[PDB]
């Protein structure tokens, strides 16, 4: 939270995770059409790609694999059953597996 906390490389990675976590959610739920926020449009591309992907979870796609990662950290820190995050709902509904769309 703050004070005398230390961010090690590993934690800074997890921090960048939560950053691209928020990036994922933002893109997933961004209703603002004029929002040209850099991470938004980039995430929205990454997200909307998973939508039309088929190599996603069969151990093929990198993008959809990594997006699954972000959505999974987030999936535990999420409650919404109709969450905007694509891979969140696939993950936190399965809970056991990970593959999206089974």
């Amino acid at each position: 939270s703050g004070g005398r906390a230390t961010q090690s490389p590993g934690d800074s990675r997890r921090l960048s995770i939560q950053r691209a976590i928020q990036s994922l959610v933002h893109a997933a739920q961004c209703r603002n059409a004029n929002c040209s926020l850099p991470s938004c449009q980039k995430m929205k591309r990454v997200v909307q790609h998973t939508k039309g992907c088929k190599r996603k979870t069969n151990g093929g796609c990198p993008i959809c694999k990594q997006l699954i990662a972000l959505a999974a950290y987030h999936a535990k820190h999420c409650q919404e059953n109709k969450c905007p995050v694509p891979f969140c709902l696939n993950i936190k509904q399965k809970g056991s597996e990970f593959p999206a769309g089974n």
Partner: peptide, 16 residues
């Protein structure tokens, strides 16, 4: 197992 390596935060690394 236990969180995949999230290359997405590398693919989309936010810099200003």
């Amino acid at each position: 197992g236990m969180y995949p390596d999230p290359g997405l935060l590398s693919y989309i690394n936010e810099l200003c």
